[PDB]
Design a binder for this molecule. Structure first.
Ligand SMILES: Cc1c2[nH]c(c1CCC(=O)O)Cc1[nH]c(c(CCC(=O)O)c1C)Cc1[nH]c(c(CCC(=O)O)c1C)Cc1[nH]c(c(C)c1CCC(=O)O)C2
Ligand SMILES: Cc1c2[nH]c(c1CCC(=O)O)Cc1[nH]c(c(CCC(=O)O)c1C)Cc1[nH]c(c(CCC(=O)O)c1C)Cc1[nH]c(c(C)c1CCC(=O)O)C2
Lengths: 356, 356
């Protein structure tokens, strides 16, 4: 692959001093871009995910507009449950659905052996290699997957939920079957993540997007052990294969209560939502790990000048060390690309003033 | 297995009132689908049939496109003569061939004892169990086999034929050897069909695709007795094994002359080709059995609007009771998947208007 030209994101993830604060945006390849919607109109969502050229184009689109310090591959967390044998659809205006969710323990019988999942996800690896080549070293490419608990919630709920009542009912009423499922997911995730690195990913982010529904007790029993196992096993397999381990990011949305534990779970970077004050987060996690985040995505509805002041304040609170700027969640479909530009530019401008 | 969610097909097969007319399509897993051709490119035809995962994938493909009310397992009728010890190939662009067909009575000596055939077809049962699990109760799964006479025609002709002259020459010149062969086939078919149900099939279709070459006299002597024996013996063995018998469908293509007899042969459903007017078929078969069919597959070359009108007319002629919609034969390789979608949608839409 082409030599990396701008490695600021990686240096920051590993905890090194940089000349400025690197920035990227969750969902930067997304519906807020008119050109995303155009390229997406040609096929259905999961079909787009299976086309290396389409995924590469979507990944590059934001970089053509903004000097972001990282690219994230276009894919979806739900490719893993699909590869395990569950049917998944994208419903117009209503998002992902599994028409036949897991509701009893016997439903685990229809899943594939997790060791065969990476072979079913060859299309993602093709997308990653292509995108890594076409990026031509401009910035690093991030691979990703969903965390075991978050994937479990989709598999049991059959889609999004405001309470995760059915998935939590599995934790309380079916604890053994829940651990069985979480282990199947972990065992599928590890070879998939390793495969993403072999294919060219230079960093990995694990999305625990449904962390906040669990309190500390359930999170410690059912989410954390698997988050830890994913990082430990990925690094081990990469070492055994003769490859350089990559920095790994854990993002647990609404996971304020788990920050201390997440900073000791074997991830270089802990991603934060917008509800945690940066100074308090720095207290919980300590001085080694790098923090990523955490601007309220809705702040991008403010004027460009107001976005600038909000960024200044955020950066002052995090400080220049051990920090990658991002939003606290993904960009929303109705946001203005110019305001996204204003966010990127302000991070770069103020972080330089905070150093020089 | 997972609880069945949409049982409309089964209720219709058993003669019960439903909210709408269920529809499926012969050869719905077929070459008209670009994705079928892709998954089929990886192996030879009979090798595909021996891979449970490949058969499951092919079975599910049409369901991802269309809300069909049944799935039919991907396999072939010719697995039975192969399991009896005959070598069979799939010839590019020319279809199935037996390079050493049965031509004299002494050729029966190389066949296996029919009681061992089900043990040779374990791969089909594996495909069925897997597909039943992965369908996750969405719709019922249909198993199938060729009828004795139709299988005999392939074994003697060595492939397709426009006249069945060699196979009919056996009926007239070698009647005893013909009955011997037909009995061997029946005795192989019964344990195979029973095995398909044990493995998870929820209905069975027997394809008498070469019925029309026989007139009434030959059909009554050489095809009908074996069609009757298959249904009687399958139901008996299922009862003896403690299992629920499934609805059985007999499809005798170009079998206009046998409809009355076929309705008294122990099958819940009689499938019809497109040359029989639905109202005349209802007259021959009477008021108990369910009819399945019968749209000219070539009608799918018409525009989507024209397909809608043809479906309306077909459904008006059959009436809402005792009816499962299908084509009058399998889908052809050059048909447009969108037009197949139009057929499925029109059945559902008009059959609801014909009730409410
Ligand atoms: C709507 C939706 C999708 N996929 C998903 C949903 C939410 C369902 C719900 O809970 O109701 C599932 C999903 N996909 C992803 C997550 C992680 C947490 C989150 O960001 O919401 C989750 C929870 C990462 C992603 N999903 C996607 C990426 C790729 C990176 C990128 O596109 O920039 C990632 C990491 C791509 C994606 N995936 C989808 C779209 C529309 C896009 C484009 C981005 C946008 O406009 O939202 C479909
Ligand atoms: C070409 C052919 C095949 N197999 C056969 C032929 C015809 C030979 C001739 O008389 O010249 C033999 C066969 N296989 C089947 C039948 C029943 C009658 C008929 O449908 O023609 C017959 C007569 C059922 C089937 N054959 C198949 C199924 C599985 C159900 C499904 O695939 O949807 C069934 C019930 C699968 C099959 N089998 C084959 C293909 C290409 C496919 C995919 C479907 C397509 O594009 O045609 C090979």
């Amino acid at each position: 692959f082409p030599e990396l030209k701008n490695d600021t994101f990686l240096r920051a993830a590993w905890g090194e001093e940089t000349d400025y604060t690197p920035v990227w945006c969750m969902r930067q390849a997304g519906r807020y871009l008119p050109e995303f919607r155009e390229t997406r109109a040609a096929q259905d969502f999961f079909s787009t995910c299976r086309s290396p050229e389409a995924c590469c184009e979507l990944t590059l689109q934001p970089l053509r507009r903004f000097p972001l310090d990282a690219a994230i591959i276009f894919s979806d967390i739900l490719v893993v449950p699909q590869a395990l044998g569950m049917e998944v659809t994208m419903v117009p205006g209503k998002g992902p659905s599994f028409p036949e969710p897991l509701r009893e323990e016997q439903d685990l019988e229809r899943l594939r052996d997790p060791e065969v999942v990476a072979s079913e996800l060859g299309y993602v690896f093709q997308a990653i290699t292509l995108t890594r080549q076409r990026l031509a070293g401009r910035v690093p490419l991030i691979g990703f997957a969903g965390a075991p608990w978050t994937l479990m919630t989709y598999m049991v709920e059959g889609g999004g939920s405001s309470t995760m009542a059915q998935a939590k009912r599995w934790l309380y009423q079916r604890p053994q079957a829940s651990h069985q499922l979480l282990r199947i997911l972990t065992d599928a995730l590890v070879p998939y993540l390793v495969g993403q690195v072999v294919a060219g990913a230079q960093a990995l982010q694990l999305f625990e997007s449904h962390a906040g529904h669990l309190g500390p007790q359930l999170f410690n029993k059912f989410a954390l052990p698997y988050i830890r196992d994913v990082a430990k096993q990925v690094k081990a397999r990469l070492r055994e294969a003769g490859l350089a381990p990559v920095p790994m990011i854990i993002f647990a949305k609404d996971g304020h209560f788990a920050l201390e534990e997440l900073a000791q779970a074997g991830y270089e970077v802990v991603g934060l939502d917008w509800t945690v004050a940066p100074k308090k987060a720095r207290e919980c996690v300590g001085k080694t790990v790098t923090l990523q985040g955490n601007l309220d995505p809705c702040a991008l509805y403010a004027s460009e000048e107001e976005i600038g002041q909000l960024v200044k304040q955020m950066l002052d609170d995090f400080g220049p060390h051990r920090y990658i700027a991002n939003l606290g969640h993904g960009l929303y479909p109705d946001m203005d690309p110019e305001h996204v530009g204003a966010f990127v530019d302000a991070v770069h401008k103020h972080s330089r003033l905070l150093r020089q």
